[PDB]
A paper describes a structure:
We solved two crystal structures of DTX1 in complex with ADP, with each structure having one ADP molecule bound to either of the two WWE domains. Our efforts to obtain a DTX1 co-crystal structure with both WWE domains bound to ADP were unsuccessful despite having excess ADP in our crystallization setups. To gain insight into why ADP ligands were only observed in one WWE domain in our DTX1-ADP structures, we investigated conformational differences by comparing the bound and unbound WWE domains in the same structure. While the core structural elements appear to be conserved, some loop shifts are observed in both structures, with most differences occurring when ADP is bound to the WWE2 domain as compared to the unbound WWE1 domain in the DTX1-WWE2-ADP structure. The observed differences are in the loops that interact with the phosphate groups and may reduce the surface area of the ligand-binding site in the unbound WWE1 domain of the DTX1-WWE2-ADP structure, which therefore might discourage binding in the second site. This would, however, not be the case in the DTX1-WWE1-ADP structure, as only small conformational differences are observed. Comparing our DTX1-WWE1-ADP and DTX1-WWE2-ADP co-crystal structures with the RNF146-iso-ADPr structure revealed that the residues at the corresponding distal ribose-phosphate moeities binding sites in DTX1 WWE domains may not support high affinity binding to iso-ADPr. Specifically, neither Trp30 nor Trp111 would allow for a direct hydrogen bond to the distal ribose oxygen, while residues in the loop regions (30–38 in WWE1 and 111–122 in WWE2) would not contribute to high affinity binding to the distal phosphate group. Our biophysical data, however, supports DTX1 preference for iso-ADPr over ADPr, which may indicate a mechanism where it recognizes PAR via both iso-ADPr and ADP moieties.
Residue numbers in the entry: 20 to 183
The structure:
Amino acid sequence: GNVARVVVWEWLNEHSRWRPYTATVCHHIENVLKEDARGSVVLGQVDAQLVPYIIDLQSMHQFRQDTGTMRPVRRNFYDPSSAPGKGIVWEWENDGGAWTAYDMDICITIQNAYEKQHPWLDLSSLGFCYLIYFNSMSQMNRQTRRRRRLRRRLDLAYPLTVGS
Ligand SMILES: Nc1ncnc2c1ncn2[C@@H]1O[C@H](COP(=O)(O)OP(=O)(O)O)[C@@H](O)[C@H]1O
């Protein structure tokens, strides 16, 4: 009953980047974890688009049914004052019109810049040649100058638990 933190389940992708599940999915994973620490989260029950994937809480891996391949997952934690504590989410648009949430650490940084009335934010130190402009609400590649739309939604807060 001492410290409060935000649960963010993340999965490791081909670019060695920890990608976050949505808040809807993270609440579902936690609900399964509370019941049995050796359980298996059928992501298809909460998200029909994640129907091939299974989260094996024993080995802490994302399991593919049809192929058998695995990707490491993790139950990561962030400050309750950050964006996942409330459900603030920053997403960018690809060529096809689909919106994709930033990495959780970058997403929090964007929200920190925004609320401080920072005109823009530079992710070069973070390992991203990208520049985010809040006035135009757009992202720009520092090297290629290519731009993409930016948006911020109020989705669902990520699960919040207590550290003793
Ligand atoms: N939990 C997830 N949520 C959304 N997309 C995912 C997830 N896990 C994997 N992907 C996407 O699936 C693609 C790779 O397919 P994957 O299911 O990992 O099998 P394999 O790596 O054997 O091709 C990656 O580009 C990744 O972006």
